[PDB]
Design a protein around this nucleic acid. Sequence first.
DNA 1: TGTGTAT
DNA 2: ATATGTGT
DNA 3: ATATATACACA
DNA 4: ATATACACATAT
Lengths: 213, 213, 442, 442
Amino acid sequence: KVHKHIKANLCGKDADTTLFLTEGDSAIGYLIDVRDKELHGGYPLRGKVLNSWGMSYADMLKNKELFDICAITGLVLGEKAENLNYHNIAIMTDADHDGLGSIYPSLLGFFSNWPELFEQGRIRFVKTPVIIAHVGKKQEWFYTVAEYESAKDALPKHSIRYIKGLGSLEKSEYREMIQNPVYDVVKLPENWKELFEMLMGDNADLRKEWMSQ
Amino acid sequence: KVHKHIKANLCGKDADTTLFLTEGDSAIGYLIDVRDKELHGGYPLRGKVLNSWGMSYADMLKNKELFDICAITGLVLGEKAENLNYHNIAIMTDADHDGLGSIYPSLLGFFSNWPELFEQGRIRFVKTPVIIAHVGKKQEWFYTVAEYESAKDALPKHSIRYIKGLGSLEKSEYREMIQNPVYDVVKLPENWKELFEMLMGDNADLRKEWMSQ
Amino acid sequence: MQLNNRDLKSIIDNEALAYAMYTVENRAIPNMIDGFKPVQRFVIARALDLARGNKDKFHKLASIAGGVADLGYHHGENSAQDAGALMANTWNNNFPLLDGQGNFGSRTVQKAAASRYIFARVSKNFYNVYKDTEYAPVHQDKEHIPPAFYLPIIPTVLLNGVSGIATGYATYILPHSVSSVKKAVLQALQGKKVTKPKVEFPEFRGEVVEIDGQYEIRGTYKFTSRTQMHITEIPYKYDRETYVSKILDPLENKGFITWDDACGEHGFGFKVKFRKEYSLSDNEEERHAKIMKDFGLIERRSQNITVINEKGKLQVYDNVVDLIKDFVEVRKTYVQKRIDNKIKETESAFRLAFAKAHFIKKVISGEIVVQGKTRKELTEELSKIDMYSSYVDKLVGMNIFHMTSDEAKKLAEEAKAKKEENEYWKTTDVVTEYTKDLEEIK
Amino acid sequence: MQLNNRDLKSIIDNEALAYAMYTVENRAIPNMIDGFKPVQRFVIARALDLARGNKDKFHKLASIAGGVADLGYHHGENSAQDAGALMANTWNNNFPLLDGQGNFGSRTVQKAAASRYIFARVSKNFYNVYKDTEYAPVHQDKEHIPPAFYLPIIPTVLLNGVSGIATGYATYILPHSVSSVKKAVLQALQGKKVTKPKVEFPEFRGEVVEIDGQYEIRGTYKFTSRTQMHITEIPYKYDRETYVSKILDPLENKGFITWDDACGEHGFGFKVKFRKEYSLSDNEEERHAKIMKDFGLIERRSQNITVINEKGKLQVYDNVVDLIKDFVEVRKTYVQKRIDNKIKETESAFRLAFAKAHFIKKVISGEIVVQGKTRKELTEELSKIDMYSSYVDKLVGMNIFHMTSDEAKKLAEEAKAKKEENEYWKTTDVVTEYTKDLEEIK
DNA sequence: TGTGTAT
DNA sequence: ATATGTGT
DNA sequence: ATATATACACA
DNA sequence: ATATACACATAT
Ligand SMILES: COc1cc(NS(C)(=O)=O)ccc1Nc1c2ccccc2nc2ccccc12
Ligand SMILES: COc1cc(NS(C)(=O)=O)ccc1Nc1c2ccccc2nc2ccccc12
Ligand SMILES: [Mg+2]
Ligand SMILES: [Mg+2]
């Protein structure tokens, strides 16, 4: 059907099949060998994501990496999302700002077209160790720089390894994070069409205030 | 029509319209600035040319560069060619070994399927300068690597700028080459058919024997 | 199998704030002082590293933009090539910082070759206006090898003209002249009223007229007869293909006028004849208005000055004069920092040279014994002198060539020069040094 | 527009022959001396220049092949990147001449990352075997800075295994073990009969056998019982996907076998269980043969040795033994050349050291009147003395810390010990130096 | 049908 | 509706 | 960031 | 070697 979609052997059923929207092709090239036989599929996101906020569904679907995601998954733009091919979306990006601050909120805004999914927890963000340390057998896995800054002296001596993106992870670390995942479950607050119109809207004047307070 | 092909104002009509066959898109881009829009055409060749000798007529119109060459000029492989859209075919391959020894002879072998165009003089090679030098008070063109050594001592003062590729030519020398062409007309000898089985043929023994000498 | 539950809010406040502030402060808005976006700073730092001693070498743009990843760059490698290609253009740069070589195109047809075939080097302009690079600040990050910003003499953010777009803010600065900007900075340095610098679009034979902050770019025609005129210059926005496809061809469609192409190596040059359908009212004001309105020759532009101050925060200005005054104040502070650093360095150099001269005079007079000691022995027996205790290894680390007869006089002259420059740095204030550096710009 | 007449026969005899002569001797057939194709020579030379002081630093391949063009490469930049990526493999190389860091894959999965998002450096193996590169012959081309070929100790062409097509010729050489190659080189050096080196694939748990020129590579299986077995090793040509989808699943479909994986670090292990359809015979001979043939643990590969000799012309060797014999025959001459160059170098160094010792002894004695002399007078007095006549520039250019009463006798002892390394390179032959460099191979 | 250096 | 310049 | 097609020669 | 698309803001 669509290429670069690594299928899961149990796709199209009611079990917890998980899709990992890794950002790149190297991440999925590493994932294919280390993933589980079932309940694990991947689709790369090449480049930045189109803003899915405001325009019609017909015009919105005219982008490649929205038609692709709506084809791999059961997500139909203008109807309820219950008969999905998979069961959980597991968005994973790099450790840089471009990952969690541009691709991640764009995907969240696109998935906001079906708000029914958020309180079911079937959209999640896979964590990624920004800092890895090999203290002998011990594998320190710091997911944000604050933890490593606050834990630089609690351990006798460690050797850090700055992870640039998903292509800098070794096969063992990718396998560990792929069968032992640390998920961030995202839930919409009471107001969600008030910060997403703020962030993905055309009126930059709201953002003029937003980056000040 | 056909992309990457720049037409003329008298294509399909009686005139000495030329279809230059370059080896790179940079050459076509520079030509479009100098192309006399009524007596000049153009089409670039991306990769090495398929060895067309010995292949069936059904499997020859499968390589894109061979389909577009036979479509732009109007040449038909089977029947005689006398209604060409261009009066002349010009090979403006590079001065390196890969252009003068692989693309040029392979294109000659492909064009040999209609031998008539060889005695009419409608197929020729645009010789390309190599050792362009500031001999005396202006730029001087040398066409072969051996010609430089043939006249190296005779030059009072000069500079050296090797033409590695067709993209290394600026607009002035390209204009001189196009508006004042130097052509080499290819005439096939009596044993032309037995000379294209010795290089395009599927018998490495004859190639080994020739290469030994 | 950890499932941390975090709200959708306080995600926009932690990473989306992080990404937007990152685009504003570190991606696509030039700093006030050096005028560089950080990617351009990385590219130019790598270019200076590649220059070393042989600064005239034309390195490829796949090499200048290939070793930037070990200086602090995180955002790929095919984007520093384009960033290095845009500052290497030989026709779109009013004050180029990277001197280039390759198919850059021209104003007639504007299409450059692939960035991987473009050769670049640090231009003479960079060595002219940028100074005190070793007195530049230090980024708080350890990985960010290049300084926080460089220290030019004039505001570079105005000369070449910039257009950056970030999240929530954007900047657009038209290309100002080098003469007008230099004059304005000289006026602001000496505490005088600052005259607005003039826009000086590169290789332009037209003129710019500012009206209500809406700078108008205008070309020039020439009526050689009653039914023939010659368009001599067209506004900078246009190229030949756009001019033909947008104005003249339509004009031909109107049938009102017929034109000819006289373009050459020089700038745009056209000829045109008028048919009966085109009005030719003798009043030259109406004719001028008609020629302007139907033959282009008028481009309206406005500035959106938005820069990053020395504190790393955004600042939106309203006039070039205020930016020039703020830049001159910050550069005066950095000039005072340079003054302090230089007086300390020259004092240290003068002490070192004085010790060298005294030791050379002692050995030429035989006061010190050189035969019979060791490394530690000689070091201990010479470092016991209080005035020789400052430097011992470097003081003794010179040659028989160095302890020569006339070399003693040469060392005395060097000490005299060190003293002279020490008094020069002790006496000279910020204004004198700044005007000396400003007058040296071509 | 001028017309000249050319014949197709002259075209093929002048133009196409030049291309045929090119991609045989200059593009895709390894030099027998060093086993490097011309692109790999450029990549290795660029890596050598990049290493400099930090030999352990990992440089990017995009930077490793982004400067071969100035080294004489006339063919692009991506081809050199791919050649370096293949060269810098970690597992496929029996004797890695380029240590690599990146996603090189393994025997289980064979796919590099991007040939640019990987790092490479000169491995310790290269600095071991490639003992001499300065004395290598110079290319006839004036723009070919890398030598004609490098000068390794053992022939590295058959160490890793080359495979290169050409026009009218082709080459295919199997990998060989370093120990067997070293033994063969030793035997050819000291005149005894040269045994055939054994084929050793990297991280290979199987065994190879020579059958009348062909090489049979056999996998290893152990019968757990009369129902199931464990395949521990497979031939080198089989990847995981190819083995699974080409010979395992086909037979598994027809009720024959039931297999499962045991891959790990030293992976490619499989466990299989025999069904009823698979008619296993209790006779061990035919059972062994049928198990070897059905699962394809048996492969046969034939060498196709065609190499560029010292003269630059193609040469075909029927046996690897003749290859090694000719290799050591020419390496004898190259090592003798190295011996002569080191003789000259040691002679010059001994002259310099003795001149330095005499100069120090004379200044300690005080006979040299350094008082009241300049550089001109110093040179005038020094060049008149015969032993100081040869060396003037660097003979009187030492730092003071270099000379000392105790370091006077230290430098005298150093000059005395220089006789030992002068005699080392004099009273020996090719056999001794070659044997010592052969013993230094781990 | 692979295998490695070039357009 | 469109250009400009760093990112994926 | 990836995805696009040919030559050549032996097994 | 070239072709492959989107994010951002604000005049015009
Ligand atoms: C025929 O060769 C090419 C064809 C195309 N597309 S098309 C519509 O003409 O069939 C595109 C590129 C090429 N040539 C290629 C290269 C040319 C020069 C240098 C490197 C090249 N690398 C290529 C890699 C894969 C496919 C084609 C390449
Ligand atoms: C949407 O972005 C892309 C789409 C495609 N098309 S497809 C059918 O394979 O899904 C291909 C590439 C991209 N992304 C691009 C880049 C991504 C990362 C780094 C550099 C990129 N450069 C690109 C240049 C032109 C077009 C897309 C690019
Ligand atoms: Mg070429
Ligand atoms: Mg990144």
